[PDB]
Amino acid sequence: KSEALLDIPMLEQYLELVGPKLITDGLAVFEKMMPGYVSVLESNLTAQDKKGIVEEGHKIKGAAGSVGLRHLQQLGQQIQSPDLPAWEDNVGEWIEEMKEEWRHDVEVLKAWVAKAT
């Protein structure tokens, strides 16, 4: 769903204040960097490197939010929050979930910008 995976209001504002090119430009940079980010999370997880997990989750949180991918930003926030009581149990699922869905979320943003312009 659009309203659920994307930050629609922020996106519509950017279309007006900046235009779609810088969005599609960011998207393209996001898409090429994600593979290495997920890998790093995956590796920090298996090595039981908490600080490492939290560092990469923050990085992805920042990157996703800049392009309006609200849902991925929300996952990165959880991954970077070890004060959450269920962090220990759930961090593995959040990372896997991110792994399986990031490309899909990117395809939804792309369709939206294409329709929105």
Positions touching Zn ion (CB under 5 A) are 97, 101
Residue with tokens 């898409």: 31
Reported for 73-81, long-range contacts at CB under 8 A and 24+ positions apart, including other chains, are: 73/7, 79/41, 79/53, 79/54, 80/54
Distance CA 27, CA 24 (A): 5
> Which CB, 21 or 103, lies closer to Zn ion?
103
Residue 60 in contact with residue 98, Cβ under 8 Å?
yes
> Which CB, 42 or 101, lies closer to Zn ion?
101
Minimum distance of Zn ion from residue 104's CB (angstroms): 9
Q: Which two tokens stand for residue 1?
A: 């769903």
> Which CB, 15 or 97, lies closer to Zn ion?
97
Minimum distance of Zn ion from residue 19's CB (angstroms): 29
> Which CB, 31 or 97, lies closer to Zn ion?
97
Minimum distance of Zn ion from residue 74's CB (angstroms): 8
Nearest-Å Rg of the Cα atoms of the chain is 15
Minimum distance of Zn ion from residue 60's CB (angstroms): 13
